[PDB]
Design a protein around this nucleic acid. Structure first.
Lengths: 48, 53, 48
DNA sequence: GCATCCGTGAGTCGAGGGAAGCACAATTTAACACTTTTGTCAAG
DNA sequence: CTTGACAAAAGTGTTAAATTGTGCTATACTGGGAGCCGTCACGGATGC
């Protein structure tokens, strides 16, 4: 479209890494400045 | 942790080293908030099938 | 002699007949480029 | 003092690589006449 | 913007047919088998 490319997002490889670490029963959680969890899965893996 | 701290005053160096290792593990578990029994699996997680297609 | 200028090379040059082989490694079979294409199943990264 | 166990050992590329039956009960699928709704075409 | 039919594509019950899951077979039988060194060499850590 003749525009500049947008700002990128989290890679899918990191999501795969997180899911594999969870499969190893390791609670990997991405946090923010205030230690609150940040959802990198766009709410697609949160049970409601 | 209290017993390990008390044993940490033993004159023997090997006893203090063993106490230090055990106490480091205990301190890690206490500060992290994890439970030791969580090291044994009761439910095994299953990877999403698209990562194991 | 120099074919561009017609003047001789300032020093005598070793000129002879030598046997040269054309090897199997050709840029025709080695040049490759890609903008977008197939991606991996799990990591979704480009194939190789 | 030594004995044992464990983790580590460059990059990119291509090229081809690729004991068995048998009977029987459930269950699922295909098919099949029928009711539909879902489009259409006819004018009012 | 409206009925007033109507061909048809879709949806709805049962049924006969494949398709699939389960039990059972009564001479007697009673502790595996593939292993196999150019074992890779060398630090780091534990622990007797």
């Amino acid at each position: 479209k003749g525009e500049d490319v947008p700002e990128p997002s989290v890679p899918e490889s990191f999501r795969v890494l997180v899911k594999e670490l969870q499969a190893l029963a390791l609670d990997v959680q991405t946090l923010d400045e205030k230690d609150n969890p940040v959802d990198i899965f766009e709410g697609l893996a949160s049970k409601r | 942790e209290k017993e390990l701290l008390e044993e940490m005053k033993h004159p023997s160096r090997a006893r203090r080293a063993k106490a230090r290792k055990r106490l480091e593990v205990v301190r890690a578990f206490l500060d992290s908030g994890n439970r030791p029994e969580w090291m044994i699996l009761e439910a095994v997680p299953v990877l999403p099938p698209d990562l194991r297609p | 002699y120099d074919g561009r200028t017609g003047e001789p090379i300032e020093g005598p040059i070793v000129v002879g007949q030598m046997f040269i082989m054309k090897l199997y490694h050709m840029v025709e079979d080695k040049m490759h480029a890609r903008s977008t294409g197939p991606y991996s199943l799990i990591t979704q990264q480009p194939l190789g």
